[PDB]
Amino acid sequence: GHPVTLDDLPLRADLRGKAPYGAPQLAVPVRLNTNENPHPPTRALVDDVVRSVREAAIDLHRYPDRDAVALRADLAGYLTAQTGIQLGVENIWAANGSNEILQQLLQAFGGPGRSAIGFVPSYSMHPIISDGTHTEWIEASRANDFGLDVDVAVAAVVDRKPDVVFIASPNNPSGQSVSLPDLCKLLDVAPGIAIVDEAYGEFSSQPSAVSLVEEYPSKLVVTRTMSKAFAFAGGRLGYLIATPAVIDAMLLVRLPYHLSSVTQAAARAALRHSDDTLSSVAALIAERERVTTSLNDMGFRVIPSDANFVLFGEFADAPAAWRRYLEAGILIRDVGIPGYLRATTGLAEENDAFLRASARIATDLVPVT
Amino acid sequence: PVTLDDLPLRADLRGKAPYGAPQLAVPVRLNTNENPHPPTRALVDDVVRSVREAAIDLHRYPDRDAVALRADLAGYLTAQTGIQLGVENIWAANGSNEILQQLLQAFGGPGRSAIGFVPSYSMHPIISDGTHTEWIEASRANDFGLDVDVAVAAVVDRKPDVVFIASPNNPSGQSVSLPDLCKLLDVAPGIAIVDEAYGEFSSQPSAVSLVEEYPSKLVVTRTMSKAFAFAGGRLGYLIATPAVIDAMLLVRLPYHLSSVTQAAARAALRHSDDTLSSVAALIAERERVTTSLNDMGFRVIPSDANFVLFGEFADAPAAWRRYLEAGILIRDVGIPGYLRATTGLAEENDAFLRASARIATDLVP
Ligand SMILES: *Cc1c(COP(=O)(O)O)cnc(C)c1O
Numbered sequence A: 001g002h003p004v005t006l007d008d009l010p011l012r013a014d015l016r017g018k019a020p021y022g023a024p025q026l027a028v029p030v031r032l033n034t035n036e037n038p039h040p041p042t043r044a045l046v047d048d049v050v051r052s053v054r055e056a057a058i059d060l061h062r063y064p065d066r067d068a069v070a071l072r073a074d075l076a077g078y079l080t081a082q083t084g085i086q087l088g089v090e091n092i093w094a095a096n097g098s099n100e101i102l103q104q105l106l107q108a109f110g111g112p113g114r115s116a117i118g119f120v121p122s123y124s125m126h127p128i129i130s131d132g133t134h135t136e137w138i139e140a141s142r143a144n145d146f147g148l149d150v151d152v153a154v155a156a157v158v159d160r161k162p163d164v165v166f167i168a169s170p171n172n173p174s175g176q177s178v179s180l181p182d183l184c185k186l187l188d189v190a191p192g193i194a195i196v197d198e199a200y201g202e203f204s205s206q207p208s209a210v211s212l213v214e215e216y217p218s219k220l221v222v223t224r225t226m227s228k229a230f231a232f233a234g235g236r237l238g239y240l241i242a243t244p245a246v247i248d249a250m251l252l253v254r255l256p257y258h259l260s261s262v263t264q265a266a267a268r269a270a271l272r273h274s275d276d277t278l279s280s281v282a283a284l285i286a287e288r289e290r291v292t293t294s295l296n297d298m299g300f301r302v303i304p305s306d307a308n309f310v311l312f313g314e315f316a317d318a319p320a321a322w323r324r325y326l327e328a329g330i331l332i333r334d335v336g337i338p339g340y341l342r343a344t345t346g347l348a349e350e351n352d353a354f355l356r357a358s359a360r361i362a363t364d365l366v367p368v369t
Numbered sequence B: 001p002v003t004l005d006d007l008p009l010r011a012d013l014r015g016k017a018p019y020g021a022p023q024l025a026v027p028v029r030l031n032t033n034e035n036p037h038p039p040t041r042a043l044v045d046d047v048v049r050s051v052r053e054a055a056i057d058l059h060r061y062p063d064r065d066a067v068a069l070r071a072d073l074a075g076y077l078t079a080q081t082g083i084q085l086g087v088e089n090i091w092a093a094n095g096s097n098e099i100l101q102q103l104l105q106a107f108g109g110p111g112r113s114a115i116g117f118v119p120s121y122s123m124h125p126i127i128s129d130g131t132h133t134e135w136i137e138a139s140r141a142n143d144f145g146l147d148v149d150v151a152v153a154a155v156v157d158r159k160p161d162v163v164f165i166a167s168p169n170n171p172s173g174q175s176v177s178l179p180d181l182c183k184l185l186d187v188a189p190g191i192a193i194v195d196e197a198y199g200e201f202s203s204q205p206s207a208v209s210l211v212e213e214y215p216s217k218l219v220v221t222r223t224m225s226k227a228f229a230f231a232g233g234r235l236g237y238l239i240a241t242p243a244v245i246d247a248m249l250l251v252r253l254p255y256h257l258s259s260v261t262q263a264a265a266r267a268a269l270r271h272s273d274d275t276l277s278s279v280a281a282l283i284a285e286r287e288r289v290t291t292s293l294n295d296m297g298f299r300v301i302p303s304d305a306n307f308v309l310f311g312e313f314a315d316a317p318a319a320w321r322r323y324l325e326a327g328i329l330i331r332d333v334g335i336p337g338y339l340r341a342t343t344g345l346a347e348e349n350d351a352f353l354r355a356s357a358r359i360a361t362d363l364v365p
């Protein structure tokens, strides 16, 4: 007769009529819509991953190291070297992407009866994971320049007393880092925890927010990923930096053995080539400034970025423009900001192609006053 | 320094301890139900080669929907059970743990409840708790098997949104009969999750054959951690009507399954026949252990898996410590008078048995 549908299943009412996350598939020539490193791993990196996976592969019949100690120590070491801030294993917690880190953090510190705040436009997954963990999502507005409006942000935290304060720095999708003084103002008033999502920290010209953990150990958690600068999006590894008591809190919410032996071994291999991979950052940053200068030169408004992408406009109709970029063979991202789109910084050839299409597409800019 | 108490942790996480036995140094480990046979060079080479291929593009995000893996999973289980399954019917995640978490997210959670029939699997209450699904218990029979009248009555009475059934059961090893299963499915108002982690060991048909009959209710879970000897890769999956997969897409964290995890697991599946050729030998060992334990005075619950619940100790935790002192690590599952011994290599079973001969003197007369 009729196959059973989702309507026929006893799904939660609060999940009814919702669509799954994710843009539909597209294998088109130029993809600059997810903030991936465009430089594939080097042969030497691939060999080290492979050798580390081969080593662990002989004991696949056994459960992996539950607490992933060696990985966490290697993350501590990388980040110590990277920021001059002294960190060890006990300050680090890892999981399958930042997504899972955020989920774990909201289970421990948000969840039912609790709330989280974001300053918008910011990162799409923050409200989605809040929703997923049944944490109330609250919004306050960034400034007209897309940067933080710190008085508005502070007033909202004071008024609403959210359990979790989200701050993305460099922000996605505008690319702007939050100044440390703005950060400290929020930290001062946040009553629960603050999560500073430093997914783009490696690309940024200002100190890591890990420098502040010592100053705010009962509130501050910093998150990083291996998905962007580290060119390890395929391996799904994110981590957090905090006071050791936060690690104990993660042990209460994490699914035991969440990190596989394969994943732990591969990530360790990626970290042993950190210097090799992060050498790119220089070139990507250069390319991002070349793109920015060229778009500016052509009459586009471009938000200055501290990350590996660019938010730019102002289109009279941003989705129409996004469709035109598509017709030219360029996949960039519509992040739901009226009049703006977000273009990931790619290989030179890909950026050249983005710019060539933008030259033609500049005719759909809002006319000037 | 700040402690966990000084953090603004949820009130309902206070007083809780992290899940997991500390990973101790002992010569014979028979406390987690892993397959004791390491992978062959043929399997390892395939995994490595497949991961190398995946490693070339680690800069890119993986297949979101893990399509080829799910289809291979459907191929395996089709050939295994004779029940025609497609990619349509399969969802995979990082272990049954994440499978269970996702199911509870979609079908359990705040305001809703789950029931278990005890003693059974420790992670069912833990993942219910973790998803804020209320946890309800009804007792199994004295023989550790299901008491179907009590189970059915508790489901009718409490109208749980999720009914957990472990089959074969952990820790008793007992499969739930198809008729008992059908009685609970009939009364279940929401969904029933049949956790079929030990299905490869079981002498009875998989519950997947019932999905056709209860498509709006029945979800079956399976794992690669046990018979499949792939615990280290963390890969679990469910089998259900295609609409349940659509539900999983609403709760899953996008890109939850790494490109590396997908390639490794697909490689392991290409060697399923060879890996699973140990099943018969493991069962033979389990039966030998059972007989030997019986001959020494122990009571052993008949098992349909790769372990044995046995007793009756005057002091089961104390007994667990004797085994430990004797070099043998089994599992205390918190059942007074009983302990759980995984079936391992012949040598390991002999050592367990050898220790069991002296520890027999601690048995209730
Ligand atoms: C891309 C991005 C991430 C990365 O998520 P993973 O799960 O680590 O891939 C995290 N946070 C922000 C703000 C991002 O833009």
Ligand SMILES: *Cc1c(COP(=O)(O)O)cnc(C)c1O
Binding pocket: B033, B094, B095, B096, B097, B098, B121, B166, B169, B170, B195, B197, B222, B223, B224, B225, B226, B231, B235, B236
């Ligand atoms: C061992 C076991 C599992 C396996 O869990 P994974 O997360 O897949 O390793 C699942 N269910 C039961 C009842 C078990 O005993």
